[PDB]
Design a protein around this ligand. Structure first.
Ligand SMILES: [Mg+2]
Ligand SMILES: [Mg+2]
Ligand SMILES: [Mg+2]
Ligand SMILES: [Mg+2]
Ligand SMILES: [Mg+2]
Ligand SMILES: [Mg+2]
Ligand SMILES: [Mg+2]
Ligand SMILES: [Mg+2]
Ligand SMILES: [Mg+2]
Ligand SMILES: [Mg+2]
Ligand SMILES: [Mg+2]
Ligand SMILES: [Mg+2]
Ligand SMILES: [Mg+2]
Ligand SMILES: [Mg+2]
Ligand SMILES: [Mg+2]
Ligand SMILES: [Mg+2]
Ligand SMILES: [Mg+2]
Ligand SMILES: [Mg+2]
Ligand SMILES: [Mg+2]
Ligand SMILES: [Zn+2]
Ligand SMILES: [Zn+2]
Lengths: 91, 25, 97, 214, 127, 97, 201
RNA sequence: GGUGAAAUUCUUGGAUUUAUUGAAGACUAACUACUGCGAAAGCAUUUGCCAAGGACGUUUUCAUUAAUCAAGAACGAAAGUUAGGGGAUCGAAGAUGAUCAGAUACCGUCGUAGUCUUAACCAUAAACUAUGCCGACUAGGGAUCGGGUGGUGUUUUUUUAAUGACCCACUCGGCACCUUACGAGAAAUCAAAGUCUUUGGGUUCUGGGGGGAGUAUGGUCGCAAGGCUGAAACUUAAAGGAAUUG
């Protein structure tokens, strides 16, 4: 029984702050609250608290990451750059 | 006048009548 | 009405080719609607060939011509290059001459 | 009131080993003063002369060669392989309509540890008696020919440096081995190496560099 | 026999460059462009101007070290006309007919594997 | 491939899924090949590897998560190790493995 | 009061039997239980600390020292990092591009830590309300809120007073101005809405 | 440097030219064609991976399962929009040098947005073959792309082959051209635009003089720009198509 047409989680701010701020905030809220797959044990138990800190419900691993999301676009394109340059020092 | 410009003419002409009307909304 | 069966030029069963820029006026233009003239001409010319070997090392040397493909825009192809204009009948003939 | 010509130091360029004339040409630098001598300053310049000019024969009229100057002694400065090009006229001739172009390239390491990227080119030929006016390959042919050209070229390198690779290149040893394996696929024609470039040199090694000299 | 330089005649429109350098290229020997030897600004590229500049360049070349030269003729290149200017011919002529040697000359014009959108806009330069 | 072989073992043969029951098989020597999923922790990996050379059991390191090793064996739950008790029709024991 | 997480990292003490705990700034992707390698001869992986001289150009590195051994200076805020754009082995240097866009040359012994700092993207989310900012500076310093010096009286501000709110004289102030004068755009070499890409050359 | 010609502009800051190296983003020249593929948009560097497709071959399988389609839905050039990145090039805007009676332009210069990419919108192009789809029938010809079949064919040498590339004949299924016109059309032309007053194979859609006007209004979709749907009053004897001669 779909409760709201658009606002979603952002319907807590009501009419305040204006639509384009709620749009922007909703996107990053949906990002930060959602449960994420755990690289190490492979159950999707990774949740945030304290921006940049993502830990797992069980197996209790904690990963440092983006403020509102686990892996940030730049972090990845750095992850591959470090792959690359390291292989230069190997082969 | 070029059909394309004649079209842009009334495109504008409509957005303005759109305006004035909403001032009475 | 319709003045050509090839429409502009030479496109059937594609719907999009890709444009090239005209050598003369830079106007973009479809590759198969363009008009291409291979420019193959010796580096030197009529005159300088005799005075070339005369001032040159090596027997007769080599003489390496330069090859570059030309792309014209119609309106630029019309202004100079292969055009003239043809009669209603003479248009059909694709013979190069 | 200057005319640097009335200052300039002069010089003559000497070439490496497996070639015809180790003498090449002349140059100009500056006097070797205290503070900016003529020696370490430039030297390592690069000169490009057709090898038909340095092999003397006209069956080599194309195929420019890049030499790089490493060491200097006493108004005599030698040089080493920096690359190989083609003449623009030859290529621009070679690419004719009505046929299929084929290219390919690979990066590979030699014995003396120069790394290089070599190129290749080929063109589908009509074989005599063929009545169709174009003669194009099957694009599965194109992938195959590239594959063999690849495996062939990765073998000819890693032989003894460019010392042997230049010695391999000069009488086009690769061109026929290509033509050999290829004809089981498609006839082609031309088939040259067309380019090679030097992207990583190992190190000076005055002991090795002097091996082309005497 | 001779002592070899390298020519590199850049002939564009509205000017023509003739300057010989050392066979390694890093070192000059004179220059004298095609604008120098006349002043109308509209005659900058013409053969008569290019001829004179070929004369002044062949002099200084033989006036220092160089009896012989290899030439690389050139056009604007890049995204531009790719077809040589008017005063590259008059230059080669008047520098070989000047009494200097010639050998093994090719075309160094930059030709891309095409890109970097040409100027003048999609509609072209319209006059 | 290796999962196409794995699916054969699954339908024609005997296997045990999970760390506890594949030590049962590794202790009894009832095990022939054991498959270790990519991400399973290195301590468990090293322990399963130590029981393995004690039973002379060959070990195959599956490149993929315990999530997919579970879909490799046709199950809807993740599995970090599989132990092959009886190879089925499949050739896994005598092939590249 | 800090936008990026910290990583408490534990090392043995080489000269005494004991554990010495250090506080790094957690680089993104670093995780609990990971092993961290600090040294000249250390491998290049996210989280390790290496002298700038020991990494190829393009390596991306955080918390990097200005002088060697200053225990880290540059690019510590959540999301930032420096890039190595080159080395000059004689008089050994390494050239880096800082987050500001600047280029700077430091000692090749100056240590970075591989990767980018965690917590990035924090500034993308709108504060949305006074309190969220309130609670922000409450853990930093007492900078908030901010009275416009144009809403004060003259005695209060260079911009103070008037029968309408207006600055009344150019708001660009000289570098050579004096304390109590500098309120405005200080030493501003241009002004107005920046049109066009910025991006140092 | 740039133009018909110039000027703005760049030059002890050695500009333009040269050499060596490096960086960035875009692009894929020539080969490239009356040639390929895709539902259309559209799609040209290499290689690996991922799934997909037509045509053909078929004494394999199922057995009417199909044709076309209001509603509804997938995709949909360029520009444009939201949020990051990127921002080499070219470049709406703007500013300039000229030209002009004027010159808000055409030409030259600077250059914002844009141009590229990710996530999401937008849903439009002369999105053109200005030509619905399925089926049948009606006429010649030489090329060509893909599949196949036939040959004591050619070229490849080795020792004959095997292959591969080629040649010749036939057959499907393509992209087109050529000549015909029985036939059609107002003509231009058209192997369909034919088998139509000798008017009926199946089906979808749109039009009913011009202007008003794709305007008003309502609904609906969109962040917006706008998209789909879409009148009337009034006006008017023409507007229009192809061909002919001037
Ligand atoms: Mg109002
Ligand atoms: Mg007309
Ligand atoms: Mg189209
Ligand atoms: Mg005109
Ligand atoms: Mg306060
Ligand atoms: Mg305030
Ligand atoms: Mg304020
Ligand atoms: Mg007050
Ligand atoms: Mg005061
Ligand atoms: Mg004041
Ligand atoms: Mg005031
Ligand atoms: Mg005010
Ligand atoms: Mg290409
Ligand atoms: Mg519909
Ligand atoms: Mg303007
Ligand atoms: Mg003006
Ligand atoms: Mg005019
Ligand atoms: Mg439409
Ligand atoms: Mg046969
Ligand atoms: Zn976990
Ligand atoms: Zn043109």
């Amino acid at each position: 029984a779909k409760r709201t047409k658009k606002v979603g989680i952002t319907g807590k701010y009501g009419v305040r702050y204006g639509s384009s701020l709620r749009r922007q905030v909703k996107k990053l809220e949906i990002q930060q609250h959602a449960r994420y797959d755990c690289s190490f044990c492979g159950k999707k138990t990774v949740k945030r608290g304290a921006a940049g800190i993502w830990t797992c419900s069980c197996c209790k691993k904690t990963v440092a990451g983006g403020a509102y999301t686990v892996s940030t676009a730049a972090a990845a394109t750095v992850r591959s750059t470090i792959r690359r340059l390291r292989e230069m020092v190997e082969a | 006048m070029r059909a394309k410009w004649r079209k842009k003419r009334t495109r504008r002409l409509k957005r303005k009548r759109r305006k004035v009307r909403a001032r009475s909304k | 009405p319709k003045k050509r069966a090839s429409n502009g030029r030479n496109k059937k069963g594609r719907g999009h080719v890709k444009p090239v820029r005209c050598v003369n006026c830079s106007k973009s233009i479809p590759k198969d609607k363009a008009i291409k003239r291979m420019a193959i001409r010796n580096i030197v010319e009529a005159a300088a060939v005799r005075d070339l070997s005369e001032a040159s090392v090596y027997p007769e040397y080599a003489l390496p011509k330069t090859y570059n493909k030309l792309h014209y825009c119609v309106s630029c192809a019309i202004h100079a290059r292969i055009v003239r204009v043809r009669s209603r009948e003479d248009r059909k003939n694709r013979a190069p001459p | 009131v200057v005319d640097p010509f009335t200052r300039k130091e002069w010089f003559d360029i000497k070439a490496p080993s497996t070639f015809e004339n180790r003498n090449v040409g002349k140059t100009l630098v500056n006097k070797s003063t205290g503070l900016k001598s003529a020696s370490d300053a430039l030297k390592g310049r690069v000169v490009e002369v057709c090898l038909a000019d340095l092999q003397g024969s006209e069956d080599h009229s194309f195929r420019k060669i890049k030499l790089r100057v490493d060491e200097v002694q006493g108004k005599n400065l030698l040089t080493n392989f920096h690359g190989m090009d083609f003449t623009t006229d030859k290529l621009r001739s070679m690419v004719r309509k009505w046929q299929t172009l084929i290219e390919a390239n690979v990066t590979v390491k030699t014995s003396d540890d120069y790394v290089l990227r070599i190129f290749a080119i080929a063109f589908t030929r009509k074989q005599a008696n063929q009545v169709k006016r174009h003669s194009y390959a099957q694009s599965s042919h194109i992938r195959a020919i590239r594959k063999v050209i690849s495996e062939i070229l990765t073998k000819e390198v890693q032989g003894s440096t460019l010392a042997q690779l230049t010695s391999k290149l000069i009488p086009e040893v690769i061109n026929k081995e290509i033509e050999n394996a290829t004809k089981d696929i498609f006839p082609l024609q031309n088939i040259h190496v067309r380019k090679v470039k030097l992207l990583k040199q190992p190190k000076f090694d005055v002991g090795a560099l002097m091996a082309l000299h005497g | 026999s001779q002592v070899f330089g390298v020519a590199r005649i850049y002939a564009s429109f509205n000017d023509t460059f003739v300057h010989v350098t050392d066979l390694s290229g890093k070192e000059t020997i004179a220059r004298v462009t095609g604008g120098m030897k006349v002043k109308a600004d509209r005659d900058e590229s013409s053969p008569y101007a290019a001829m004179l500049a070929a004369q002044d360049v062949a002099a200084k070349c033989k006036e220092v070290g160089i009896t012989a030269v290899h030439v690389k003729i050139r056009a604007t290149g890049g995204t531009r006309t790719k077809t040589p200017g008017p005063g590259g011919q008059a230059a080669l002529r008047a520098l070989a007919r000047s009494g200097l040697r010639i050998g093994r000359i090719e075309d160094v014009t930059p030709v891309p594997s095409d890109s970097t959108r040409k100027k003048g806009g999609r509609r072209g330069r319209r006059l | 491939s290796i999962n196409q072989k794995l699916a054969l073992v699954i339908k024609s043969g005997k296997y045990t899924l999970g760390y506890k029951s594949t030590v049962k098989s590794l202790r009894q020597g009832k095990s022939k090949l054991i498959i270790i999923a990519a991400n399973t922790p290195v301590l468990r990996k090293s322990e399963l590897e130590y029981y393995a050379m004690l039973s002379k059991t060959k070990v195959y390191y599956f490149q993929g998560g315990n999530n997919e090793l579970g879909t490799a064996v046709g199950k809807l739950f993740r599995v970090g190790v599989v132990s092959i008790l009886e190879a089925g029709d499949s050739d896994i024991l005598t092939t590249l493995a | 009061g800090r936008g990026a997480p910290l990583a408490k990292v534990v090392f043995r003490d080489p000269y005494k039997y004991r554990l010495r705990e250090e506080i790094f700034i957690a680089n993104e992707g670093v995780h609990t239980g990971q092993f961290i390698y600090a040294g000249k001869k250390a491998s290049l992986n996210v989280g390790n600390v290496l002298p700038l001289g020991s990494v190829p150009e393009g390596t991306i590195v955080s918390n990097v020292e200005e002088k060697p051994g200053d225990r880290g200076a540059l690019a510590r805020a959540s999301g930032n990092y420096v890039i190595i754009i080159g080395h000059n082995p004689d008089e050994n240097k390494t050239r880096v591009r800082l987050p500001s866009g600047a280029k700077k040359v430091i000692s090749s012994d100056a240590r970075g830590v591989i990767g980018v700092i965690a917590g990035g993207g924090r500034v993308d989310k709108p504060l949305l309300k006074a309190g969220r900012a309130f609670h922000k500076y409450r853990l930093k310093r007492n900078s908030w809120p901010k009275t416009r010096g144009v809403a004060m009286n003259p005695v209060d501000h260079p911009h103070g007073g008037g029968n309408h709110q207006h600055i009344g004289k150019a708001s660009t102030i000289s570098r050579g101005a004096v304390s109590g004068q500098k309120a405005g755009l200080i030493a501003a070499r241009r002004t107005g809405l920046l049109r066009g890409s910025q991006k140092t050359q």
